[PDB]
């Protein structure tokens, strides 16, 4: 349709006829709105006029007309009839108009899929998601999500390699898209963001998908959304342990302060006071800070799957343990002193790796894990090894039933675990001694420590029995 | 290029004042929310937000100007001027181009700052030679910020 | 030459800035504004339009961009359809500038 050309006139004189045809069909369905297609069995007169009319339509060989009718069906929303044509003519017509409009591309893709041509649909959807057409972020998320699905299934005549490469590009773009969508939503809803800025954020984020650098620098880092920063380091395969840990430290501290604030507001309601202007009260005890913090760690863990570089257990577990000590998230407030260990075990950290780290914590005596607070470190080790023992015992029972002989990867216990418990007993003996000669009077934790000793000895016994042959005889009857 | 969603979260989290602006010379935009500032590369499809929240009072103006010659290391390409209701703050900027075609932005502290005074600052402009001029919505007066590398017993690094 | 660019409902324009290098076809007023001379020495000017919802990129179009686009609409037309479009260019730019644009597009 080159402008300035003089066939336009010829096209316009046909468009006036085609429009009038629309009115006829429109008035037809209108006149016969509520009329049944069959009465007493055979067809009515209102039905026959519908067939006679639509006959004339499908009996035409005017091509500009049939194009105008495809466009018209699309307009009125009749996916009913258009997807049921059969003809390629309509496919070929769509193949030209696809890279141009979202609605048309969706029709094309629908045609492909019903013909088991999933890969071709995934290609159209992906390109559309990367394009500069006016498409919203959420629609780009839907397009990518569909492409991902369609590229993950076999399409005949296309190599596995070509499928996987597309499925992979869609998966990466979908991950980034979801991040961008989380940002945009949070920023717009953020009470501490000026309206003037929000409109600006909506303009640059509710469109084509942006790079991970931009999302980090211009948005996630500026607004201190550290959880999203971490997801971004994951999606970018960001190799930088120090920055990752700095972000973990900021996330923990930010969450702690927020939980503290919410518990304060609550305490004011239960005392009669008034909350700051524009502060929605809490009608129910909010969670203690260590509970909200660990909630944050879980949400991220499930989103990244522990196999990431944003979960270096050797650095992250000591930091969380550090937090617990330095912020009195312990028995004084009614929390389980082993909560940090429980958290990472349920999360699915392998028992061997846990004990391995805890050993390092105990040997190096760093940051807060010093003096008599190593009492706490010993308790964590006791709890970790205890769970490990229980695991080995159940895996033994497990393999006696469903019979066979195996055990790969999983670290297996060595004498080092036994030695570790020996040293742990020494540390306790040392802490108890130092506690008995403190200035001001003996320490109050005498029996508390005597108990821990018994537990540790019990565990060394068990571990010694397993190590000593009771582990190779677990699938045997006693 | 849509505004990142995280900026919308901060903007709608604004208590008193927000503002948007452009650094078109380097393909960056910025948003201020109260005493916090966020920059981002708008050419990037999923930008990361460069956050700067050292400021104590509401930001009223932000600008990117050339540096004064013979003051900073050659790798410093610009100076970021941040005006609040209490002071004006200078930050070193290095906007080095990347393989993708969008400048990589890193910020440097300077210890250069001056108390604002009684006159609002809503407009900041810079000359080719790095001179920084200020004006606002209190009066028609025009101020200039001076700065130098050396500290002196009779003169501060920034005036 | 003028045009109206529509922004969607809700778009409040905040600022507009140049993203490319400042335009200059010469070093003094005479010759300075000669867009035609620099069509192939510096990219067309681009401008970032900041709104409360995003950043829109607006690009200046050169004669060769207009000429190529116009000819792209003449691909499906007559021998006289091109001559008509070409005469528009000659009446505005003159014959030499128009034929130079055709050579460039070619």
């Amino acid at each position: 349709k080159p402008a300035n050309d003089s066939r336009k006139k010829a096209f316009d004189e046909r468009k006036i006829c085609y429009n009038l045809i629309h009115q006829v069909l429109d008035k037809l369905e209108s006149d016969f709105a509520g009329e049944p297609e069959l009465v007493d069995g055979r067809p009515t007169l209102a039905a026959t006029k519908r067939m006679e009319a639509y006959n004339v339509v499908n009996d035409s060989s005017d091509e500009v007309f049939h194009f105008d009718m495809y466009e018209w069906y699309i307009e009125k929303g009749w996916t009913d009839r258009i997807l049921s044509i059969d003809s390629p003519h309509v496919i070929t017509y769509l193949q030209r108009l696809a890279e141009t409009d979202f609605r048309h591309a969706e029709l094309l893709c629908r045609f492909y899929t019903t013909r088991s041509r999933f890969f071709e649909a995934a290609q159209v959807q992906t390109n559309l998601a990367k394009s500069d057409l006016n498409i919203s972020l959420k629609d780009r998320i839907i397009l990518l999500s569909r492409a991902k699905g369609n590229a993950s299934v076999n399409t005949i005549g296309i190599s596995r390699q070509q499928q996987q490469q597309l499925n992979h590009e869609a998966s990466e773009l979908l991950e980034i898209a979801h991040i961008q969508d989380d940002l945009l939503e949070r920023l717009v809803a953020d009470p501490r963001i000026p309206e003037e800025r929000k409109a600006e954020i909506e303009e640059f984020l509710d469109g084509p998908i942006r790079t991970l650098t931009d999302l980090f620098n211009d948005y996630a880092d500026q607004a201190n959304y550290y959880d999203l920063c971490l997801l971004i380091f994951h999606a970018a395969d960001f190799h930088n342990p120090r920055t990752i840990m700095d972000t973990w430290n900021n996330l923990i501290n930010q969450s702690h302060f927020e939980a503290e604030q919410r518990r304060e507001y609550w305490e004011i309601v239960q005392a009669g006071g008034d909350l700051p202007a524009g502060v929605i009260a809490p009608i129910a005890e909010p969670p203690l800070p260590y509970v909200y913090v660990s909630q944050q760690i879980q949400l991220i863990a499930h989103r990244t799957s522990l196999d990431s570089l944003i979960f270096p257990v050797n650095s992250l577990l000591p930091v969380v343990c550090a937090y617990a000590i330095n912020n009195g998230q312990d028995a004084s407030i009614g929390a389980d002193p082993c909560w940090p260990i429980q958290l990472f075990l349920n999360l699915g950290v392998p028992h061997a790796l846990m004990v391995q780290v805890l050993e390092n914590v105990l040997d190096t005596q760093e940051a807060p894990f010093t003096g008599r607070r190593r009492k706490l470190v010993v308790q964590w080790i006791a709890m970790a090894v205890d769970m490990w023992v229980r695991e080995v015992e159940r895996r033994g029972a497990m393999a006696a039933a469903a019979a066979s002989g195996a055990s790969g990867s999983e670290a297996v216990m060595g004498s080092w675990v036994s030695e570790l418990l020996g040293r742990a007993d020494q540390v306790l003996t040392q802490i108890a001694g130092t506690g008995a000669t403190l200035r001001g009077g003996a320490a109050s934790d005498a029996e508390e420590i005597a108990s821990l000793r018994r537990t540790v000895k019990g565990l060394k016994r068990s571990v010694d029995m397993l190590l000593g042959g009771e582990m190779a005889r677990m699938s045997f009857f006693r | 290029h849509n505004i990142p969603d995280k900026v919308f979260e901060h903007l709608n989290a604004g208590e008193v004042f927000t503002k948007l602006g452009l650094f078109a010379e380097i393909g960056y935009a910025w948003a201020s929310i109260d005493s916090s500032l966020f920059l981002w590369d708008y050419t990037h499809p999923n930008p990361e937000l460069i956050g700067y929240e050292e400021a104590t009072h509401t930001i009223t103006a932000v600008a990117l100007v050339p540096p004064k010659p013979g003051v900073f290391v050659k790798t410093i390409t610009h100076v970021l001027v941040v005006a609040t209701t209490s002071e004006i703050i200078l930050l070193g900027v290095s906007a080095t181009p990347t393989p993708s075609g969008s400048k990589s932005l890193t910020l440097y502290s300077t210890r250069m700052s001056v108390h604002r005074g009684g006159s609002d600052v809503s407009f900041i402009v810079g000359t080719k030679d790095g001179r920084i001029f200020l004006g606002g919505e209190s009066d028609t007066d025009i101020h200039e910020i001076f700065y130098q590398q050396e500290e002196r017993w009779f003169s501060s690094r920034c005036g | 030459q003028g045009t109206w660019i529509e922004l969607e409902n809700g778009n409040r324009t905040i600022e507009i800035g140049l993203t490319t290098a400042p335009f200059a076809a010469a070093k003094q007023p005479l010759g300075f504004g000669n867009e035609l001379a620099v069509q192939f020495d510096q990219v067309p000017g681009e401008f970032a339009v900041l709104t409360n919802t995003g950043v829109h990129i607006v690009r200046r179009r050169r004669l060769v961009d207009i000429f190529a686009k116009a000819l792209g609409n003449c691909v499906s037309a007559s021998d006289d359809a091109l001559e008509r479009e070409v005469r528009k260019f000659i009446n505005q730019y003159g014959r030499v500038e128009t034929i130079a644009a055709a050579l460039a597009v070619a």
């Binding site: 990466e172 000026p194 003037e196 800025r197 942006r210 790079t211 991970l212 650098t213 931009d214 980090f216 620098n217 211009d218 500026q222 999606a235 970018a236 960001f238 | 901060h10 004042f17 503002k19 948007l20 602006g21 452009l22 650094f23 960056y28 910025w30 948003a31 201020s32 929310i33 916090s36 500032l37 966020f38 920059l39 981002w40 590369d41 990037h44 499809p45 999923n46 990361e48 460069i50 956050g51 400021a55 509401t58 930001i59 103006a61 932000v62 610009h78 970021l80 941040v82 609040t84 900027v93 290095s94 906007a95 993708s100 400048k103 932005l105 910020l107 440097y108 809503s122 900041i124 | 600022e15």
Partner: peptide
């Protein structure tokens, strides 16, 4: 873009109205 570029040098103050 799924490639990150940190650049604290020249940002836009997130906590200020615009010039």
């Amino acid at each position: 873009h799924k490639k990150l570029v940190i650049n604290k040098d020249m940002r836009t103050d997130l906590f200020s109205p615009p010039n």
